[PDB]
Symmetry: D2
Subunit: 290 residues, 4 copies
Amino acid sequence: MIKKAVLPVAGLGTRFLPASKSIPKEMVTVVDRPAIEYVVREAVEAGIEQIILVTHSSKASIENYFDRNFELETTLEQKKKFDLLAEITQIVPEHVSVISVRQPQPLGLGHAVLCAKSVVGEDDFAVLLPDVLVKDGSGQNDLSRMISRYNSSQAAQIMVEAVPDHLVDQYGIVDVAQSPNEGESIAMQGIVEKPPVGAAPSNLSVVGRYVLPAKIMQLLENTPKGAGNEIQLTDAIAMLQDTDTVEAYRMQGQTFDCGSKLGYLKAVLHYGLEHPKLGMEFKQLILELK
Amino acid sequence: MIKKAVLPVAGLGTRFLPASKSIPKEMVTVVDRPAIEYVVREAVEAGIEQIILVTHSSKASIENYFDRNFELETTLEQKKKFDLLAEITQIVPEHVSVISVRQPQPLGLGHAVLCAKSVVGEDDFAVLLPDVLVKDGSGQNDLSRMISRYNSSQAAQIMVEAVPDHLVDQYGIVDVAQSPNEGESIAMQGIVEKPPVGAAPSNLSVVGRYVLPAKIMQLLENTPKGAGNEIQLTDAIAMLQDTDTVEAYRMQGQTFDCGSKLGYLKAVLHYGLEHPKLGMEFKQLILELK
Amino acid sequence: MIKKAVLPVAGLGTRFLPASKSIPKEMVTVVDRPAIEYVVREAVEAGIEQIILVTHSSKASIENYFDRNFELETTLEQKKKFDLLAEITQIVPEHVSVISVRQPQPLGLGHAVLCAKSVVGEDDFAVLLPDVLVKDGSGQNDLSRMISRYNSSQAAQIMVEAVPDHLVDQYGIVDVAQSPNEGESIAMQGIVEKPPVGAAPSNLSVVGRYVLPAKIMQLLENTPKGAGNEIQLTDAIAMLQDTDTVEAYRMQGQTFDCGSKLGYLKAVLHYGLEHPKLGMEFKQLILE
Amino acid sequence: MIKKAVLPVAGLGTRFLPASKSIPKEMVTVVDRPAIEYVVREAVEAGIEQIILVTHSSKASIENYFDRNFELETTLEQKKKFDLLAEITQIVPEHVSVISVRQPQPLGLGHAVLCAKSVVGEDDFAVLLPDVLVKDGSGQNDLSRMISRYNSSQAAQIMVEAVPDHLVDQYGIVDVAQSPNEGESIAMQGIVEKPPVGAAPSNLSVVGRYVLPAKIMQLLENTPKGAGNEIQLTDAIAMLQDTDTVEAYRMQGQTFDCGSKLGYLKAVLHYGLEHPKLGMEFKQLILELK
Ligand SMILES: O=c1ccn([C@@H]2O[C@H](COP(=O)(O)OP(=O)(O)O[C@H]3O[C@H](CO)[C@@H](O)[C@H](O)[C@H]3O)[C@@H](O)[C@H]2O)c(=O)[nH]1
Ligand SMILES: O=c1ccn([C@@H]2O[C@H](COP(=O)(O)OP(=O)(O)O[C@H]3O[C@H](CO)[C@@H](O)[C@H](O)[C@H]3O)[C@@H](O)[C@H]2O)c(=O)[nH]1
Ligand SMILES: O=c1ccn([C@@H]2O[C@H](COP(=O)(O)OP(=O)(O)O[C@H]3O[C@H](CO)[C@@H](O)[C@H](O)[C@H]3O)[C@@H](O)[C@H]2O)c(=O)[nH]1
Ligand SMILES: O=c1ccn([C@@H]2O[C@H](COP(=O)(O)OP(=O)(O)O[C@H]3O[C@H](CO)[C@@H](O)[C@H](O)[C@H]3O)[C@@H](O)[C@H]2O)c(=O)[nH]1
């Protein structure tokens, strides 16, 4: 029932700038594979069949990653390395497509999502910020939970993890009665994007995983351009709360912010240890560093 | 209402090959604009809102043509040339989106169209072979008629032009009782892809302008492994006459084939003479030759 | 011996839009091939062997067009379409190097040529403005005549041809004693960039072909902004006339500006009919 | 003086995949910046001024990286964010040329260097293999010590360092007389490429740093296919040992091979800990692991 996911990938480097000058930020190397792939595989493992990149004129390498590469496939045959020729050809199942739409100017997430309007058309869709990875564990992943919850509830889902009270100006924050338990979704009565430390309806941060009705697209057309002169998505959610019901899902798994260079280095260490091939030999390389 | 049009643009440019080596065949510059624009501007003027490009890894320029180019815009401002600036920022109306999707391998026109099965969904959609221009006259354009005619008839429409009985080798050809009149569509009881010049149910060529129900995507999914090297669209329309009705609309327009190097030149001369600004200088420029 | 040409291909194509919006102006298809080709088939046919490109971020399409396109070669090799494989595989003969250096910002045709400084070193060199095609004359190509004339006179060559006195507005103009003859060179007293219509020393415009000494790089190092706050090559050709004799070669051939929207359409018409395989049938299309 | 360095980057990254599937192995991000930087910033800091790149159609992003980025630049002078501008603008000193010549087919690391003949001309040149990083904490960089030793001795330098007696069949190993000392040369009798684990002159591997006379280009033009159907450099380095004294400079620094998956991980740890802005907090994150 929820099949389409929007990834906004149209932002320039800035946050990440020397690395992401001449290649996209989304494409920077986490252990051995670009960040974007952790995001796509997350969607995929939740029954997402249509990936809708909202991309910029300079992000061809994201499109090409999920596409076949004649010169590289034939070099991987002429060297008889049918090993990788499988990993570089099945990056994504055959039933899963990948769709490119352009943001004309970087007028912010809200505008970005609104560019995937014509593709999403009439269906209820997920949104995954590809700045954020979401390492899970036993059984399903967090996004799989939210969709099935969206299905039975028919109420927009919005992932939330609790953060230090001072990093609250950095994230969007949800107004909630009591915070819900890991893996469950308590109704929410308000949301705000740039809340100054102490002026926070709670400590529960918007993680960057959503599930939203195609209404949100007509709402995005008619949101004011506030929160830093940019059209904000979390404003369009507030306008949905005026009529439709919106819940805050608490995730079970830990996140990572590959926006911040520091947050990226954290994702390398943690994914570099959970790595099923070098995870252990990596651990050994850390110990012997001092 | 038929809104989505599919432009298969995934083919390398083998026919056009010194020119299209290092830029798409579709970006080949007719008078002063790329061929692809003439095609898109034909779709747009028939209430197409969604341009679905089935593209290759190389055909970046095509996507970028319908997007905004900061570097160029800002030099058109820094130079006072507000002339061009509106021409290159409004290549299409803003209600018109341009979606993009990848043909993993070149397995034929049919497999290209099938590649947009997800972007098309359940909506009846047009197909426009972008290596073929369709200069019209007064009132509205040809594709306009076909779509109005599809909507009322609910039966697939397939543009047909009369061609000499020896060039039947080089086209798809339709089977009709009586040949229809310019601007009207008689029913058709058969289609052939590459029938050998003399064994053809008529002299009516498939022009490469279609309107097709979403249904045809599941047929494409189960077409014989090709009529030639690869999977053919015309084959998938044979399997449509097995259940639904298919009509042949006879165009009232004159066409050009920018696939053949000689067809390209023909079009340069024709669009070059009908040019609002250069048109008559061009005439005077041709007249001056030995 | 003159070996290294220096094509400045770093300018966006504001003059030819929307054609050159997504592609470079140089890859504007003329009959059945990019423009740059014709200009590089000029350099080579006059014994140039190191085509230096001063390019931009946005102009990979040029560098790719003078290199092997793997997916295209292997598809054509398999299908045994040796005709079309011919047209892509040997564009410039195997001995011809094609070199890239980026013009970081576009501060003018001078700054442009001064970006090829390190790669030219101490070698005397030609400059071809790709925006402008020159059409092969009887046997010899105009550029060969110039190179061998610098190779004898050791004095810089500057290709020139007449223009209507009112269009002299928008070229470099050269001052002359006896007005040099068709295929002849003749000493000059000075050069000036985009001079005002009336009060310009002649009707002879700088075409876009030069042969210079590697001395010019140290003149261009000094030469200040002299047009749109833009470093000019002419303003360094001035500074050269100060010390060493400079000449003005006059065109034996015929020329097109693909800068102009009309100049393009003219080049497509001429090269059109003169085309080996297509000219014959093309000549028929016209008459209809 | 020695002023030109010849970086061969025409390889695809089959060794580091799917890292390099859509971005050059050279633009694989170490800590916060592409690998190639470190190599180029190592050449610069030994008075290299013309960084020649032998490159491939896929390697546009290298040439863009050592060039101005009009959108990024103006969109940083906008928010007056001079820190990040600092990072993209003078990545290498203003006095440094960066040249691009294309390697038509990948016929080997000799054929690669021979493609840069018409630009090295008659001048003696360094060659930096970009896959191999060299961290030089001494104060002077291993390449300055080498360039001044060729200057003084006029003898073709070759960086070498010790590798376990197994895994000698990866590198090209040298034939050392008196076994040279840390950061100083010793004349070598011969050199062989990827020799069998057993038939090994020494345990001293060719690292990837070389300083060579433009004699090589005339040798390289007349050496046949060595190991695989590849024109080795090591084989042309032998053909110079036949006539001129060739020395074997021993590493003082510490290397990494981003060719290998661990080499990368190890470089992202080391360069990571000795990072200015991140060292202190990265050191913090490694301690927070368990
Ligand atoms: O015009 C734009 C602007 C942004 N982006 C993308 O948007 C994502 C993140 O948006 P950004 O503007 O960086 O905002 P954040 O600071 O990441 O804040 C967002 O993400 C937070 C979690 O990281 C949430 O808490 C907030 O609600 C949400 O606004 C990135 O992947 C960008 O590439 C676009 O594609 N186009
Ligand atoms: O795998 C492929 C093959 C082709 N194309 C593109 O799709 C079009 C197909 O044209 P082409 O491959 O040359 O086929 P044609 O020989 O033109 O045949 C088609 O076009 C005829 C009219 O031009 C019709 O009458 C036929 O029914 C139809 O099969 C071109 O624009 C190609 O670039 C793709 O995108 N993918
Ligand atoms: O910073 C720059 C400026 C120009 N160019 C290129 O140089 C060529 C010519 O530059 P342009 O500014 O178009 O030249 P003009 O302003 O027309 O002036 C030159 O071109 C005329 C040819 O038409 C000559 O008559 C003039 O004397 C000569 O100075 C073009 O291909 C540009 O792309 C660059 O690469 N970088
Ligand atoms: O046709 C070619 C072949 C190689 N390369 C590049 O050359 C570099 C080094 O060559 P590569 O083939 O990756 O390594 P090997 O050739 O296996 O080994 C090289 O590197 C070893 C150290 O890693 C040395 O000991 C060897 O002498 C040297 O040949 C790589 O970045 C390649 O991209 C090219 O650009 N073009």
